[PDB]
Amino acid sequence: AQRVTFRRRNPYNTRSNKIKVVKTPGGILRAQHVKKLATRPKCGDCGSALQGISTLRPRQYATVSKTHKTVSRAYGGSRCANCVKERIIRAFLIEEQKIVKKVVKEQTEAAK
Amino acid sequence: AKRTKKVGITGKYGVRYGSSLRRQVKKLEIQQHARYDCSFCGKKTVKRGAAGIWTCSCCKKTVAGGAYTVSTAAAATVRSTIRRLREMVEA
Amino acid sequence: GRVIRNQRKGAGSIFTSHTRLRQGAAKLRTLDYAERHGYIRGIVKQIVHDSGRGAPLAKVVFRDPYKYRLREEIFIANEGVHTGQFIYAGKKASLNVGNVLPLGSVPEGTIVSNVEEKPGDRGALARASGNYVIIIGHNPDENKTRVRLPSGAKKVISSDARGVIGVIAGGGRVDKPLLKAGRAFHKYRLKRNSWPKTRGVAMNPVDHPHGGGNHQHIGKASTISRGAVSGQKAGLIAARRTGLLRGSQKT
Amino acid sequence: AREITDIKQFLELTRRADVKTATVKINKKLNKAGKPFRQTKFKVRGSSSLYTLVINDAGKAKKLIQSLPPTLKVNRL
Amino acid sequence: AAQKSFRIKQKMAKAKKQNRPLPQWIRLRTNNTIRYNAKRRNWRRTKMNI
Amino acid sequence: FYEDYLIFDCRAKR
Amino acid sequence: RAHAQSKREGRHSGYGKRKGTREARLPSQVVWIRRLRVLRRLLAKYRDAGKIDKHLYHVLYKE
RNA sequence: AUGGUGAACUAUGCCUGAAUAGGGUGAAGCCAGAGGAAACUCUGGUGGAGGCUCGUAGCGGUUCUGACGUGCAAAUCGAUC
RNA sequence: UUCAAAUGAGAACUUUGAAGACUGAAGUGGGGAAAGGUUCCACGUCAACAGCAGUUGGACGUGGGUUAGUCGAUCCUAAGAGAUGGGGAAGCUCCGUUUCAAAGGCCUGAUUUUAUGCAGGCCACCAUCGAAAGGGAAUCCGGUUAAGAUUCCGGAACCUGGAUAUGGAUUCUUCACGGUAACGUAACUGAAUGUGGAGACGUCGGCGCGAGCCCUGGGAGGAGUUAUCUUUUCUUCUUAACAGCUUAUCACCCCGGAAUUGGUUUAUCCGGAGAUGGGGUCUUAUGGCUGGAAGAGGCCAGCACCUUUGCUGGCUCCGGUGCGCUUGUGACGGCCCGUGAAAAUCCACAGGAAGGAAUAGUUUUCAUGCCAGGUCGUACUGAUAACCGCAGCAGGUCUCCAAGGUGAACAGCCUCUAGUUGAUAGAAUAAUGUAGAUAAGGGAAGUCGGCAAAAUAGAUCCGUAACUUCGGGAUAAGGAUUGGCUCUAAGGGUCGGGUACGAUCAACUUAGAACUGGUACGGACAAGGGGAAUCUGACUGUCUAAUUAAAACAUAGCAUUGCGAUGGUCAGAAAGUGAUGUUGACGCAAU
Ligand SMILES: [Mg+2]
Ligand SMILES: [Zn+2]
Ligand SMILES: [Zn+2]
């Protein structure tokens, strides 16, 4: 039934100051200051957590390699695979329909 | 079972605030806590987020509408008036 | 006497607005070249709630036509506007909902919102939940447009002025009773400190004109001239009539 | 801090020229209820990390010790 | 406080060094009228107000 | 400095 | 420990040793949760074994 | 009357944070079952709402017009609330 | 509170010991914020102070004492404050903070009089201040002092900034390969500009998971009890930051094509916009194994000595349970005319400027290796004695950890750990008091008034009116039961079947029956008096700090009024000034 202390000088139960109680090699209970939890990166289009990317705080994303932060696809760490698929399809298709819209007016005014 | 004859969702307000006001609030609370038909996905998923904001759980679309209903009658009228004037002028 | 509550509301100490959660000023796009020679396309990226505003806002994204940039405008959403929707802003734009035509470019009976009263106001008249402006007629000579405002007032403005087609969303909002001082407390917690209101007749005469008495009573009339000065204007300012409205508005 | 599990990496590591010290810790362990045995740990002090090699066969350990250089200061214990 | 400014700490240090009785050899000097330290301060009696 | 409250009596005074 | 042993055997649990409600001592929601977990566990085991088909599994789930 | 100092008490607003046992009642929504010369109701559960409630910590401060009333106290104490 | 001893001139009060007690984990404990400022600690010491005493002390006198790359400030913005330009003002100064301003600085270089101009190009924000509780680069264990410690020692790590070499990777198809895919890996060019994410977020409810704690079995050790009993009561059996391998609800991919509709949650949602099913990918919260690391730390035993003092050995293991407590977290649900910060900072992406190899090259987001990390704070109290109240004042003053039993319960009552045993004492026991209690018979006759007190009280079962806004009234009213012991019944989990059962493990919940007893039993604590009616205010809520808590104020609801911006209401000495207004009649202002 050992009781613990905040090991720093901030006494208040703030988000910055969460603790986990941990038993040490001395046998005692001690408080251990845990950092805030890391939130996953999201796709700009859908807003959903996008897999293959490591979960960290923003300054810890500068310690690690590219592959913890990117998938090998175009729009890797930024857009979901499905969003990418959708915009590929949209791109190709409405480019083709722009061609079609062009030749339509071309032959129209050529007729008149 | 049925638990209330006539107060329904307004049993949480108890005896307070008067029958006529509880009626008025019933008629709108039902409306806004209801699910509605999505015009894009065809499903019964559209639920209010806030006043005038109706979101579809599937299709993840968001629509501006009424505070307690998706479409006001006054705005459906506007939509029809507008369709008519649009297809009246070049036609 | 003492300075009264209405006089204290101009210093703006505790009576200012609470404007932190508000997303921004819901202005129309600046009137540049496109909006008066053609149209420009934008896309609605999200409809959101604005604190202290019963109408939702629409984050429309347009492109800058001069620099590779993606300037984002904050529109008041209209009833029927949705995400993924294309908005067309300009003179040569189609008469669909969400679009920002000029008033010269729409027929009579058209229903419009966020109307500029002068071109380049970027939003005025018909901005609140459920409210709309009607176009009555035109004057292509001395280019002018007659409109009907939500008040019943007929106004004449420029046909080069703009307006968003359709009705402002959030209608029916005041058809629900609040039932609760708490609900009203939270209503005004995000606008401004205007609530609760104590009655002058329940005050002391140092604090109000209506104050004092061995009975609660105004004593003198509550109809106050417009030529009255700050500290007297408590009651019914420049009341043309008073009492219960038994009939039409004689207009 | 780190384990290594192949002796060749360990020998490559002992000749890194930032390595100065090593220690050799003997423990007594129980694979099962029928046999206690002599585990050993070879620990090498790099400038930034400590590398540890766990050996459970004393026959390999007594060879690995003589496989060390003389430049490395060892601490038996 | 414990988390304190250097300026405050400095002014405290001065007060500490000042918290002394007389040196008793001043009383022996010629034409001396100082009998005791009349500016003497104690943490219970009188506060600094800094 | 002191304004004690018990000398205040209006019972039987007026 | 002696008192606990006696309690296990059913002692010291009559009406005169109860200062709290039945739902305070053991909630109805907890009992129901245990019960439904049991029934759903069983029906799922029976499906996976083949002692029951999905068409009966469904009606028994909802029942 | 002139010129200055004060929101460390308190009043109110804003920003940023923190704090608040166990119980009772048992609202919507949902499941099953029964009933129906057609129509839709009834029962049992689930669920866990409310500027609801009993009642802690906490905030207040009703009564004893109790103690004290040159006090422990220039407003406290105790029970009761 | 008591006894003894020691100290001393002297002991109700100091110290030690022995005993008896209390706080009783919503503590008289252990830490902090503010404030205080050396009160911390030692030595000496008692004239004053400690409302008696005093050998003692927060007193007196003399001295020592606060160690940081990682904790914080420092930095960012919040509400807001406030220079500049300009404009007002006789003026002290006011307005305003991006404004009617010519408001600045960043990469590559190009030269090789040479230091830095010209060469280009880029870029337009437009001071600064504002949080020791917001955001935020990174450290943990053990040990150590009279007094310091995430700061010192020892060991083991990490971040930033900058230098830089080696190895590896890559290239003659110049700037990687694999996988159907989800995606993966040790790495595996990428300037301007642009997008996107993180930072970055309510509240409540229950469900799941984890941690620590509680509980508990076996075993290895030590202490206790032992007239009698007790395979017994108590206690130790621990494992940090960091690193590596693995580990997941959600989400996603592939095959495939669903009604006889299925899957599925405590909670009812999901599916031809492709379910179930089969196979896989991912986040690594979290947990497990290993390293760290047993060498440490804990429990013990033995042999030793004026001594500094040790020296030597062993053991430090294996499990289980749960509406359990606290806490963290995940996936969901409910609420809203309430939808519950910002910025610094970091990353990724798009793009493709420029630069690049073959007798040799480019790359330092891969590994290893080198250097540095400044300034200030850091003691102690944090309160019936360190702060504020004139003081050693029963007052006031922000927060964290939180054992066992009873029991619904951080209720009340007893106890362990830790801490106090302080508050002027002695002797008697008159009246009167204060606090607390009891009382024959009566039963509000008392009194302005049932003031005060009593009575009631929990849980289970039964039963429950008028009235009603149909939601309530309602625990209405009103009745019965409750202990201990011995039994009974019911309610579960996991394993087991060619292509109906059996074994095993473990829970507190309910119900019942016998038996028993000076008919007692929510046995202490705890814990509603109720009913019929009236005046009044709808309710919840608020105020006269220190005589009035109310019927007063507010409230939702109602109604009225003004205003379409060159405006209404209000402010200012003025102003190129302001609040409403990040507004626009479903709004603002006034009643
Ligand atoms: Mg018939
Ligand atoms: Zn996506
Ligand atoms: Zn949809």
The H or E element that residue C158 is part of is: strand C154-158
Distance, CA of A56 to C1' of I164, in Å: 30
d(CA E2, CA B61): 56
Residue A73, CB, less than 7 Å from strand I?
Answer: yes
Q: How many CB atoms neighbour CB C74 within 10 A?
A: 19
Residue C151, CB, less than 7 Å from strand I?
Answer: yes
Which residues, 6+ apart, have CB-to-CB distance to C108 below 8 Å?
C135, C136, C137, C138
CA geometry: angle at B81 spanning B79 and B87, to 5°?
A: 100
CB contact under 8 A, C111 and B61: no
- Strands C72-76, C86-90: parallel, antiparallel or unpaired by DSSP? unpaired
Same domain? For A12 and A59 the reply is no
Same domain? For A32 and A51 the reply is no
Q: Using DSSP, state whether C98 is helix, strand or coil.
A: coil
CB C77 within 8 A of CB C118: no
Q: How many CB atoms neighbour CB C174 within 10 A?
A: 12
Distance, CA of C45 to C1' of I282, in Å: 28
Alpha-carbon distance B21 to nearest alpha carbon in chain C (angstroms):
7
Cα(A50) to centroid(ligand 2), Å: 7
Distance, CA of A10 to C1' of I387, in Å: 19
Residue A97, CB, less than 7 Å from strand I?
Answer: no
The domain in which residue A25 lies consists of 1-37
Q: How many CB atoms neighbour CB C189 within 10 A?
A: 14
Q: Using DSSP, state whether C186 is helix, strand or coil.
A: helix
Same domain? For A19 and A74 the reply is no
Q: How many CB atoms neighbour CB C125 within 10 A?
A: 24
Q: How many domains does chain A have?
A: 2
- Strands C144-148, C154-158: parallel, antiparallel or unpaired by DSSP? antiparallel
d(CA C176, CA C172): 7
Question: Which residues does chain B have within 8 Å of residue C54's beta carbon, measured at their own beta carbons?
Answer: 51-52, 67
CA geometry: angle at G46 spanning G42 and G48, to 5°?
A: 115
CB A49 within 8 A of CB A41: yes
From the CA of A83, the nearest ligand is: 2
Neighbours of chain A (3+ CB pairs under 8 A): none
| Residue of chain B whose Cα is closest to the Cα of C93 | B86
Q: Which nucleotides of I are covered by protein (CB under 7 A)?
A: 25, 29-39, 58-62, 65, 71-72, 78-80, 132-143, 150, 155-160, 176-179, 181-189, 193-201, 206-208, 211-214, 216-217, 233, 236-244, 250-253, 260-271, 273, 281-286, 290-298, 323, 328-330, 334-341, 345-351, 365-366, 368-371, 376-382, 387-388, 391-392, 398-403, 405-409, 416-417, 458-460, 469-472, 481-489, 491-494, 497, 499, 508-512, 521-523, 538-540, 547, 552-566, 568-571, 578-591
Alpha-carbon distance B22 to nearest alpha carbon in chain C (angstroms):
8
Q: How many CB atoms neighbour CB C113 within 10 A?
A: 28
Same domain? For A47 and A84 the reply is yes
A102: amino acid identity, one letter: K
CB B76 within 8 A of CB C153: no
Two tokens, residue C55: 């109408």
Which residues, 6+ apart, have CB-to-CB distance to C122 below 8 Å?
C27, C28, C29, C30, C31, C116
d(CA D70, CA E11): 61
Same domain? For A62 and A109 the reply is yes
The H or E element that residue D23 is part of is: strand D21-32
C82 touches chain B (CB under 8 A): yes
Sketch the domain layout of chain D as residue ranges. Answer: 1-77
Neighbours of chain G (3+ CB pairs under 8 A): none
Q: Using DSSP, state whether C52 is helix, strand or coil.
A: coil
Residue C115, CB, less than 7 Å from strand I?
Answer: no
Same domain? For A105 and A57 the reply is yes
d(CA E12, CA E4): 11
d(CA A59, CA A56): 8
d(CA G50, CA G54): 9
Cα(B63) to centroid(ligand 3), Å: 10
Q: Resolution reached, in Å?
A: 2.8
Two tokens, residue C123: 């939003």
Q: How many CB atoms neighbour CB B35 within 10 A?
A: 13
Same domain? For A81 and A32 the reply is no
Provide DSSP, chain B: ----SS-GGGGTTTTTT-HHHHHHHHHHHHHHTS-EE-TTT-SEEEEEEETTEEEETTT--EEE--SSSSS-HHHHHHHHHHHHHHHHH--
Among C91, C92, C158, smallest CA distance to C124 is for C158
Q: What are residue G34's phi and psi, to 5 degrees?
A: -60, -45
C215 touches chain B (CB under 8 A): no
Q: Testing the interface with C: which of B28, B59, B63 to mutate, by most C Cβ within 10 A?
A: B63
The H or E element that residue C223 is part of is: strand C223-224
CA C21, distance to chain mean position in Å, is: 19
Among A24, A33, A76, smallest CA distance to A54 is for A76
Cα(B84) to centroid(ligand 1), Å: 53
CA geometry: angle at F6 spanning F4 and F10, to 5°?
A: 125
Same domain? For A42 and A2 the reply is no
Question: Which residues does chain C have within 8 Å of residue B74's beta carbon, measured at their own beta carbons?
Answer: 130, 167, 171
C83 touches chain B (CB under 8 A): yes
Question: Which residues does chain C have within 8 Å of residue B72's beta carbon, measured at their own beta carbons?
Answer: 79, 130, 167, 171-172
C133: amino acid identity, one letter: V
Two tokens, residue A11: 């006494």
Same domain? For A73 and A110 the reply is yes
Two tokens, residue B7: 């107060």
Same domain? For A71 and A108 the reply is yes
Partnered with residue C89 across adjacent β-strands are: C40
Same domain? For A83 and A108 the reply is yes
C55 touches chain B (CB under 8 A): yes
C159: amino acid identity, one letter: S
Among B90, B51, A90, A95, smallest CA distance to C43 is for A90
Please give residues of chain C from 82 to 111 whose alpha-adjacent beta carbon (CB) lies under 7 Å from any atom of strand I.
Answer: none
CA C30, distance to chain mean position in Å, is: 19
Cis peptide before D36 (omega within 30 of 0): no
The experimental technique behind this entry is cryo-EM
Same domain? For A42 and A32 the reply is no
Residue with tokens 């988390």: E3
Two tokens, residue C179: 């039932």
d(CA B82, CA C106): 10
CB E50 within 8 A of CB E5: no
Two tokens, residue A4: 């613990």
CB C23 within 8 A of CB C8: no
d(CA C11, CA D11): 81
d(CA C119, CA C102): 9
The H or E element that residue C60 is part of is: strand C57-62
Question: Which residues does chain B have within 8 Å of residue C109's beta carbon, measured at their own beta carbons?
Answer: 81, 85
Distance, CA of C52 to C1' of I196, in Å: 29
d(CA C74, CA C54): 15
Q: How many CB atoms neighbour CB D71 within 10 A?
A: 10
Q: Using DSSP, state whether E50 is helix, strand or coil.
A: coil
E-assigned strand segments in chain A = 19-23, 29-33
D6-42 in b/e form (b: 16+ CB < 10 A) is eeeebeeebeeeebeebbbeeeeeeeeeeeeeebbeb
Half-sphere exposure of C220 toward its Cβ, with a 13 Å CA cutoff?
Answer: 12
Please give residues of chain C from 21 to 40 whose alpha-adjacent beta carbon (CB) lies under 7 Å from any atom of strand I.
Answer: 21-27
Cα(A49) to centroid(ligand 2), Å: 8
C173 touches chain B (CB under 8 A): yes
